[PDB]
Paper text:
Aurora-A is a Ser/Thr protein kinase that functions primarily in cell division and is overexpressed in breast, colon and other cancers. The activity of Aurora-A is stimulated by autophosphorylation of Thr288 in a flexible region termed the activation loop. Here, we describe the identification of a vNAR single domain antibody based on a shark heavy chain antibody scaffold that binds and inhibits Aurora-A. The crystal structure of the complex indicates an allosteric mode of action that is antagonistic to the mechanism by which TPX2 activates the kinase. In the crystal structure of the complex, Aurora-A adopts a canonical kinase fold, with a molecule of ADP sandwiched between the N- and C-lobe. vNAR-D01 has an Ig fold with two disulfide bridges. vNAR-D01 makes contacts with both lobes of Aurora-A, but does not closely approach the ATP-binding pocket.
To address the mechanism of Aurora-A inhibition by vNAR-D01, we crystallized the complex in two different forms and determined the structures by X-ray crystallography to limiting resolutions of 1.67 Å and 1.79 Å, respectively. In both crystal forms the asymmetric unit contained a single complex of Aurora-A KD CA/vNAR-D01 with a 1 : 1 stoichiometry. The two crystal structures are very similar, with an overall Cα RMSD of 0.97 Å. ADP is bound in the ATP-binding pocket but there are no magnesium ions present in the active site of either structure, and the side chain of Asp274, which coordinates magnesium ions in other Aurora-A structures, is displaced from the active site and instead interacts with the side chain of His254. Crystal form 2 was grown using 0.2 M ammonium sulfate, 0.1 M bis-Tris pH 5.5, 25% PEG 3350 as a precipitant. In addition, Asn36 and Tyr38 from βC interact with the αC-helix through an H-bond with the side chain of Glu183 (and van der Waals contact with the side chain of His187). These interactions are mostly conserved between the two crystal forms of the complex, with the exception of the contacts between HV2 and activation loop. Structure determination was carried out with data from a single crystal cryoprotected in 30% ethylene glycol using the WT complex crystal form 2 as a model. The interface of the complex buries 950 Å2 of surface molecule per molecule of vNAR-D01 or Aurora-A. The binding footprint of vNAR-D01 on Aurora-A comprises regions of the αC-helix, β4 strand, activation loop and the N-terminus of helix αE. The distortion is stabilized by interactions on all sides: the side closest to β4 is stabilized by Trp91 of vNAR-D01 CDR3; the side facing out to solution is stabilized by Asp33, Asn36 and Tyr38 of vNAR-D01 CDR1 and strand βC; and the inside is stabilized by conformational changes in the activation loop, most notably Phe275 and Trp277. The position of the αC-helix is incompatible with TPX2 binding, as side chains of Glu175 and Arg179 would clash with Tyr8 and Tyr10.
Numbering used by the authors:
A (entry chain A): 126 to 392
B (entry chain B): 1 to 105
Write the structure that this text describes.
């Protein structure tokens, strides 16, 4: 495997992941700054995710889009896998949401546009995402959103029992009801994110798993009074129980609330 | 010497027929346990993932270090170049040389 650790200067940790740390790094010949994600093979294997991650990394290697974190390459030694990643200097959308409590309409519409552009590019390659959480979205130097979790699939359409345990909050009804799912799951994800960005919490949040499950299955959510008519409309269209009733990504990108408030355009 | 043999290299089929593509990872102890399938349709420049399910099925044979793709009820739209692309159990990149499929109809 041609890249090797000595190709890079290593700096401070950017964060600690489940299977290892992510470091600030610099390729020595170009001085290009990037991120080096370290994963311990034994840790992946014991978690039973080692096969799945190799599938996801292969998929990720084809995805070149301004709002998808770039995978530059990878290499390994006897105990560790190293992923060479685009460096996202402004951290996670999760942290930004913690800092600001909630996002204004222009920031929100702009993120949704960037997500829709990314997902539109993916769908054109017959690639679908799993659940999209704020913690898995990173921010680039100009504050541009990057889908960063390699959470790609693989099979469409599909009926295959998801880890439902974990966090239900971001899963669409058809996945928690054990029904068939396809690329329409990504539109549900956009609705949950649009809501969480504006409100500060996801719309089906409850105190127990069983309660959250019912909220999602029955699509029981309400809006704070400050959420405007245009946002309510878009979110309500995305959070349809019936996946086929959800809009196309192009329709999201063309929604009056998005076009009035987004500082970014389509493609 | 380690390599992927993808067969057949060229396939010409009539509509409604079937195609099976085999990929075998040879001369290495690394395991081909998780291959993804890709297609660039004739005329297009866009590489797409092949979704498994429906007309598209796959098998993997641990013992022979191989994986296969079968497409049923072939359509003219299916014409294009198909590849297995994978990261083997050694975390090394592997890919077949491709199958150029032409469907007439
Ligand atoms: N490419 C990157 N650029 C900048 N910071 C990153 C990058 N990747 C990860 N980080 C930081 O390090 C943490 C790494 O954890 P993450 O990639 O979420 O690990 P996990 O495998 O547990 O999801 C993130 O929360 C983020 O703060």
């Amino acid at each position: 495997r041609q890249w090797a650790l000595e190709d890079f200067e290593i700096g401070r940790p950017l964060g600690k992941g489940k299977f290892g740390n992510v470091y600030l790094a610099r390729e020595k010949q170009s001085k290009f700054i990037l991120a080096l994600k370290v994963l311990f093979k034994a840790q992946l294997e014991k978690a039973g995710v080692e096969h799945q991650l190799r599938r996801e990394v292969e998929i990720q290697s084809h995805l070149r889009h301004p709002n998808i974190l770039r995978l530059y390459g990878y290499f390994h030694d006897a105990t560790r896998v190293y992923l060479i990643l685009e460096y996202a200097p402004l951290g996670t959308v999760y942290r930004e949401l913690q800092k600001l409590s909630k996002f204004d309409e222009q920031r929100t519409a702009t993120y949704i546009t960037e997500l829709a552009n990314a997902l539109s590019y993916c769908h054109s390659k017959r690639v679908i995402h799993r659940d999209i959480k704020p913690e898995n979205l990173l921010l680039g130097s100009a504050g541009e959103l990057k889908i960063a979790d390699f959470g790609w699939s693989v099979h469409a359409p599909s009926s295959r029992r998801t880890t439902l345990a974990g966090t239900l909050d971001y899963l669409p009804p058809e996945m928690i009801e054990g029904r068939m799912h396809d690329e329409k799951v990504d539109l549900w994800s956009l609705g949950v994110l649009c809501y969480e960005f504006l409100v500060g919490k996801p719309p089906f949040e409850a105190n127990t798993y069983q309660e959250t499950y019912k909220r999602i299955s029955r699509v029981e959510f309400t809006f704070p009074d400050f959420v405007t008519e245009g946002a309510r409309d878009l979110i309500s269209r995305l959070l349809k129980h019936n996946p086929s009733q959800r809009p196309m990504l192009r329709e999201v990108l063309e929604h009056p609330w998005i076009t009035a408030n987004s500082s970014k355009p389509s493609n | 010497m380690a390599r992927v043999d993808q067969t057949p290299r060229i396939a010409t089929k009539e509509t409604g027929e079937s195609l099976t593509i085999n990929c075998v990872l040879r001369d290495t102890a690394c395991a081909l346990d998780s291959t993804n399938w890709y297609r660039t349709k004739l005329g297009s420049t866009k590489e797409q993932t092949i979704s498994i399910g429906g007309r598209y099925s796959e098998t993997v044979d641990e013992g022979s270090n191989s994986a296969s793709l079968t497409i049923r009820d072939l359509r003219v739209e299916d014409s294009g170049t198909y590849k297995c692309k994978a990261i083997d159990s050694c975390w090394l990149s592997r890919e077949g040389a491709g199958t150029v499929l032409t469907v007439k109809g």
